[PDB]
Design a protein around this ligand. Structure first.
Ligand SMILES: N[C@@H](CCC(=O)O)C(=O)O
Length: 297
């Protein structure tokens, strides 16, 4: 096809990557004049910066990060430096904050992370921002950690396996390959995140919702873990034409069955009505047209 669209995602072993890869496949197989490809990246912040720079046309990103970027606030990457070019295409599924600790590492709560070697997320990840915020809720900062490691998901679980890291954060949909792998190769435990503590700073970071990771989701973790979650979204540049986005939406979301087959999180959590519910940034004109046509707006 002649209109090229690159979709920013995340680590190859996270959920954004397989989802973006699946979306690109649906668009390319539709033969509608669009040539799409998914790019692995550090995550939400890197993706939004790439769209702002005109390097990516679309990307997956957390709703909280998208809001901070659009409004130009809350986090260093966007404080006083708004990215008004991003638009929402659809809300997708919940991204849960996973706090994974090696057993016998002396870590039972977030407070125990003080002095430990922790993988806080990849460079340019939304994960790193959530990690800083959660630590703040417990009165800590990255300077209280023994080491704040920033690497990809694959690299992070390798460090855990080799005992070069004691804990790892990952804001990601349930069932992420990286987390499943980590649980299978290493004796781990999931650290809970107290919603009440998070609520104490909800005025600064208002997007967290309570979420329970069901016991048995990951190998060796049979107890349910109370934590928090944000929402994964598909975003795009306002520079894309209304018709390009519309055509794209039809090829991707036109056949819900085919779309949900891309990943278990979509099959489990995706819905057209929820796709336009409580968005943090404006909908792209082409998406608005699609949803109106679908009778959702
Ligand atoms: N939400 C994560 C990425 C999760 C994923 O790759 O599935 C981030 O922005 O860092």
């Amino acid at each position: 096809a002649q209109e090229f669209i690159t979709i920013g995602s995340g680590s190859t072993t996270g959920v954004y990557f397989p989802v973006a890869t699946g979306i690109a496949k649906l668009v390319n197989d539709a033969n509608v004049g669009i040539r799409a490809n998914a790019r692995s990246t550090g995550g939400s912040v890197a993706n939004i910066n790439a769209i702002n720079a005109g390097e990516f046309e679309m990307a997956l990103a957390q709703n909280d990060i998208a809001y901070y970027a659009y409004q130009g606030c809350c986090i260093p990457a966007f404080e006083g430096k708004p990215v008004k070019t991003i638009r929402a295409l659809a809300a997708l599924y919940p991204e849960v904050v996973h706090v994974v600790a090696r057993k016998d590492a002396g870590i039972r709560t977030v407070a125990d992370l003080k002095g430990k070697r922790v993988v806080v997320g990849d460079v340019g990840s939304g994960t790193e921002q959530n990690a800083r915020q959660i630590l703040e809720a417990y009165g800590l900062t990255f300077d209280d950690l023994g080491q704040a490691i920033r690497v990809s998901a694959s690299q992070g679980i390798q460090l855990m396996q080799d005992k070069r890291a004691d804990a790892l954060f990952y804001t990601v949909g349930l069932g992420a390959s990286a987390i499943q792998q980590l649980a299978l190769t290493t004796p781990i435990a999931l650290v809970a995140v107290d919603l009440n503590r998070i609520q104490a700073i909800a005025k600064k970071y208002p997007f967290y919702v309570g979420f329970n990771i069901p016991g048995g989701t990951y190998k060796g973790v049979d107890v349910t873990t109370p934590t928090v979650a944000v929402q994964a979204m598909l975003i795009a540049s306002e520079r894309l034409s209304e018709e390009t986005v519309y055509k794209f939406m039809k090829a991707v979301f036109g056949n819900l069955e085919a779309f949900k087959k891309i990943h278990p999180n979509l099959e489990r959590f995706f819905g057209l009505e929820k796709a336009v519910k409580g968005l943090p940034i404006p909908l792209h004109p082409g998406a608005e047209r699609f949803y109106k046509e679908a009778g959702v707006l």
